[PDB]
Design a protein around this ligand. Structure first.
Ligand SMILES: C[C@H](Oc1cccc2ccccc12)C(=O)Nc1ccc2oc(-c3ccncc3)nc2c1
Ligand SMILES: C[C@H](Oc1cccc2ccccc12)C(=O)Nc1ccc2oc(-c3ccncc3)nc2c1
Ligand SMILES: C[C@H](Oc1cccc2ccccc12)C(=O)Nc1ccc2oc(-c3ccncc3)nc2c1
Ligand SMILES: C[C@H](Oc1cccc2ccccc12)C(=O)Nc1ccc2oc(-c3ccncc3)nc2c1
Ligand SMILES: O=c1[nH]cnc2c1ncn2[C@@H]1O[C@H](COP(=O)(O)O)[C@@H](O)[C@H]1O
Ligand SMILES: O=c1[nH]cnc2c1ncn2[C@@H]1O[C@H](COP(=O)(O)O)[C@@H](O)[C@H]1O
Ligand SMILES: O=c1[nH]cnc2c1ncn2[C@@H]1O[C@H](COP(=O)(O)O)[C@@H](O)[C@H]1O
Ligand SMILES: O=c1[nH]cnc2c1ncn2[C@@H]1O[C@H](COP(=O)(O)O)[C@@H](O)[C@H]1O
Ligand SMILES: [Cl-]
Ligand SMILES: [Cl-]
Ligand SMILES: [Cl-]
Ligand SMILES: [Cl-]
Lengths: 350, 350, 350, 350
């Protein structure tokens, strides 16, 4: 049995397993082009999507991140009327780009229709297991019903899963099973793929179709964005790094003389109340980060620095030509600050 | 010398070394079939055995877990009359399934006979080193004396050990040398096999015989059960995850304003008093977990979630067709929640 | 250049990298033979040498460990008259075995002569770098001067180093560069070999000569002794595990309501005062352990347990036939107790 | 696409991944030759450069380290007149060797000229990404303008980067992208090479040209210097290990009853104020270390000890002939002191 014999053949890498190799460079960081074409009708100035989560992205977040060159995915833990109204708030703030999450439920077709009426630019079909017959069949039916809307669908973590979604007309495949900071899928179900490998395997398929992927989950620092893009992601999706900003939906708390905000998985127990299956996320708090504009400024600055190191004048070169080097945990220790008592907080390092 | 030259050839994986790869799925988690045939006369509704330990399973535990679809192994740190009486309590609670542990001692044959008189469904011949001449010879003699009883025998961690036990008529081989949470076998004797590899090597033999194995020890989360089953285990045995429940034999203590219960290895010093050799277990305490019904509900929910991800409609497909991906410690860090202060305890994550 | 190209070819394992595989066994732990012939005139009942260190072995320690079946190496941080007098105390306690450490200094020949006059059974030529021209030349000269004395010489960590010492008539080669608990050789000089690999490479040479080796340093638990012997060591040398016993030279201190004893490297600054080069050891304290008899009882019990698991009826079988399995750090975590609050101290686990 | 297929082919090692193998030795540590020819006109008695950082090296540091056999790189976070004046202070302290850092800015040519007028011995062209067209072109122009000055240029971490700099007449290539203790390049930009591999790849090129390299960053102990030199570095550059000395520019602070000094990356926010791009360093404090003379004495003593172990009579033999052994994290744990409560601080181990 080939299936029995190859049970443990596959290997997987995540962000902390790899570094990008410096290469000959002709481009300064400030001259790098960060724009990316997600689909023929959807181009971003910076390759960053904000996560469709009820503690990350409502209209306030989507407005802030679109003004920085990204796009926000308004979460679906609200009525169809409310979610459409959030989209109208974004479009009425200068015609900014806006995306909106939908599930595979009995309201999906009406919800998509009202979101399109509100001016939405992308529909984000968000499911725990995108590589399933019922999901692929509904997606294909959505694709034929709404022929002109940009469709993001996920999540998958394998070539075969990304191919199954591109085959039914998905424009953008969202990649990531288990890497999220608030996620417990891998300890509760035992299922996942290390995220760098998942990006790489799915990007290989996306290139064959001429489409794009979103690297979703597990990003901890600006350098992880560069790794995610160089592994083949056309853009990334961020929760943890946008959590605790002014524009995120919560209100700040004071715990032990310091400001925090709530960040919780959409599969946590509390989040599923807001909208049977056992939880696959936890509920937590993160330190108050400040404004989205300031955070994106640091992220973008890390991407530009990385691309100056790799000689990437645009994201295409970073995706196609940047090489990695594998490292051990000892290499990870060398990569972070070591043998030093940090006295002042850096704006891009905690 | 081939033995000298191959001293370090073998490699071993445990649960934290691997993840299950998501695959094309046609089955929702709630429609998954969790039943397993351990032997022609013994079928379980959920593939879970409770450990034959004096701080895990007496009649109260065996009743609770059988009512959830599993089976309990009543421990043998009691007289023959007492252990038979515990079995009668289980059978008088609605004819529930019941198993009972026996050693290889001078009372084994009488103890097995009285347990069969009490209505026991499986005999669990529990030994530290199942792959030994004296144990295999007594087991074979038990097999010929009691021809119709389901026999579990262990523990082994190699193909040759599992084969030696199946060769003398053992119905179910219990697998695990050293992985137990309360176990020190590997630091005291230096002996063991990482548990995923041990399950896989033994399951390969079990398939040749048409018999089954129990993956015993080292399970920390519900996702480890899915890994254990996908590595070839027909069912798992749990101590740590059932420790501290209402139905476990101890009484709850209050330490620093919180409830705990005693959990100790059957090879710890205190456990061997209750029933020379140096200890191979420690004595500890675990937080109070609540009822067995609530804990099994979370475990079962993780198994169903995992099988929906792998597209396994029953445990046979999970055993034969699910693939793994290997990961580093960095991948393990990504798999658990990271970079977040958990504020609310999840029912399936500590 | 082959030397340039193979700079990083070699790989090395230590105790925490490996486990012993259980095998078919015909021998109970209590029936195992632990005796070992170190040289034609030197046989031990248990394969354990106590370290020649000024906080481990003087006459009191050598007496206690010889009474348990081992042999003690009286340290040389004392005059020739004093060290010879310590040996007389051992021989006057029932003719017990006794060994004594010598350096390569300008008193070595007189010191060896007086120790032989006192009845010493083995001379332990202790040097930091045994694989050096000056050391090998003095050793060869000692071998020809004292033709009938058992000679231990070390330390080396490679086949070529062990071969160089056996070539000049060394009876027993002591193996270990850097693994000691109190040792900083590897961080100060950058030099060493992981200890399991060092034992294995040197044992390969020892078998060709028909001689023996002592696995010296890095032993943390009784299971490490079994790994050390199965990797090819004929016996082990212990410092850390005998430190803090009643029979060790220090007096007990009380720190924060608990008893401790001093344990320090013979290359620490303080130890070199007692007897230029930069220190290669640290000075520390360990918890009070109790009597040597009780500690050896636990160690011996772990060895017997390990050999029952591997089916080794004597140490020859363990050396020649026991197989290992390699494991990751995740496997190490599974091997120790995990996910449990230990409440009672085990006699063989801290 | 070969670039796509080889995205993860490369592997990298750092100091904690490797140990030096002991070898046959004819040379005592005190007889080892530590001198190194960096360029035909620049020879050092010990192979150590002090880092060109505003919390490490001004005239006071450069004087102290030159008096120990090394050379100091006076940092450039000061005017041209001030930096030239610091160099005059060094030359007026007995004609000691002195080096000075320059950037690639609009003052570089005047700054180099005034530093040469002051008697500087080496120019250290310090850039974040030495493998860039603009940097290589300015360096080549500096080489043709100042034909007789020793030129150090960096930093690179690849063979192709080192080759590009040697091709334009650089005498000494400085190697290290990301390993620095105060450095965040690898987490902010995602870019780097584990330092042992980076030294080895660049040294391979340096040998073809007959030139030299400086191993810059990540050195934590004296043993790391030996590893860095044996991996092919002709000398090392130190920040962390010289930070907090009397001769470093800061003044000592008292924090919680203990003395500290400020150590900060030249890419930290505060350091860039002293002289847009996002920070790539943090600001911290280190314990007060004492005098440079005492620290160098310990470092040099570790190098001599290492070379006695490897049988290296001079640095050429260490570079060309010393072999390494690879180890896991378990091997790293064995290499440091373990299972001991250090009571007295060692002069070469924290
Ligand atoms: C409860 C869990 O929730 C989540 C898991 C992962 C990511 C999340 C992100 C946002 C919100 C919730 C999330 C879940 O839906 N689990 C789950 C597990 C296996 C499944 O398998 C299927 C499925 C299989 C075959 N056909 C259709 C669906 N749905 C599944 C849902
Ligand atoms: C003291 C130790 O106890 C246990 C070890 C491992 C798992 C446990 C689970 C429940 C209760 C006690 C356990 C033990 O029996 N150790 C031990 C070690 C090696 C042995 O080897 C043999 C043996 C070898 C050859 N023939 C017969 C028996 N019995 C052995 C017992
Ligand atoms: C100071 C250090 O001390 C020790 C190191 C390692 C183990 C110890 C155990 C007990 C007591 C002291 C120890 C040492 O001797 N280091 C040292 C380092 C390199 C050497 O190289 C040579 C040497 C090389 C070539 N010929 C003769 C001697 N002796 C050396 C001594
Ligand atoms: C802000 C950062 O600062 C440093 C980074 C690394 C080491 C440091 C050591 C001392 C002082 C500052 C350092 C930097 O210059 N980053 C940076 C990143 C990418 C770059 O790419 C280029 C570049 C690329 C192509 N042509 C010319 C320059 N310069 C770059 C500078
Ligand atoms: O509770 C959940 N379980 C599993 N994954 C989740 C859950 N909630 C959000 N996610 C995923 O995790 C991503 C955010 O991960 P982060 O950026 O690492 O914090 C989201 O964009 C989702 O893809
Ligand atoms: O003290 C002992 N020493 C070694 N293994 C033990 C001991 N007691 C119980 N076990 C094993 O450990 C299992 C429980 O492991 P856990 O589920 O990881 O807590 C039991 O089912 C036995 O197989
Ligand atoms: O200070 C020293 N530096 C390096 N090795 C030492 C030093 N002192 C003792 N040793 C070695 O370390 C062994 C003890 O190691 P332990 O059993 O792991 O504590 C001794 O038998 C010596 O071989
Ligand atoms: O802030 C910075 N970012 C990145 N690297 C730096 C920065 N400042 C200094 N370095 C490098 O780090 C080296 C010192 O590293 P350390 O010896 O490990 O403390 C310096 O010689 C520079 O090569
Ligand atoms: Cl449409
Ligand atoms: Cl029967
Ligand atoms: Cl003699
Ligand atoms: Cl010039």
């Amino acid at each position: 049995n080939a299936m029995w014999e190859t049970k443990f053949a596959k290997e997987g890498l995540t962000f902390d397993d790899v570094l990008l190799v410096p290469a000959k460079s002709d481009v300064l960081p400030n001259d790098v082009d960060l724009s990316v074409e997600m689909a023929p009708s959807l181009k971003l100035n910076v390759p960053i999507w904000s996560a469709g989560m009820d503690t990350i992205t409502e209209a306030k977040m989507a407005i802030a991140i679109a003004r920085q060159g990204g796009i926000g995915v308004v979460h679906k833990n609200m009525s169809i009327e409310q979610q459409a109204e959030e989209i109208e708030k974004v479009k009425r703030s200068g015609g900014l780009l806006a995306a909106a999450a939908v599930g595979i439920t009995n309201d999906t077709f009406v919800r998509v229709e009202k979101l399109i009426e509100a001016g939405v630019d992308a529909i984000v079909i968000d499911t725990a297991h995108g590589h399933s017959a019922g999901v692929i069949n509904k997606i294909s039916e959505i694709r034929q019903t709404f022929k002109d809307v940009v469709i993001v669908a996920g999540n998958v973590a394998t070539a075969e899963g990304a191919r199954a979604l591109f085959e039914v007309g998905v424009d953008i495949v969202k990649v990531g099973i288990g890497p999220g900071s608030i996620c417990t899928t891998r300890v509760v179900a035992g299922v996942g793929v290390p995220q760098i490998t998942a990006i790489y395997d799915c990007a290989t398929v996306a290139r064959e179709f001429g489409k794009t992927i979103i690297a979703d989950g597990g990003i901890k620092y600006s350098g992880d964005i560069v790794k995610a893009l160089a592994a083949g992601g056309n853009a990334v999706m961020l929760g943890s790094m946008l959590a605790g900003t002014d524009e995120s939906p919560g209100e700040t708390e004071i715990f032990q003389g310091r400001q925090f905000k709530t960040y919780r998985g959409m599969g946590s127990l509390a989040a599923m109340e807001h909208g049977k299956l056992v939880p696959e996320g936890i509920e937590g708090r993160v330190p108050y980060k400040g404004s989205v504009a300031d955070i994106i400024f640091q992220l973008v600055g890390g991407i530009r620095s990385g691309m100056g190191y790799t000689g990437s004048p645009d994201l295409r070169h970073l995706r196609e030509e940047a090489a990695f080097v594998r490292m051990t945990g000892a290499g990870l220790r060398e990569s972070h600050p070591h043998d030093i008592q940090i006295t002042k907080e850096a704006p891009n390092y905690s």
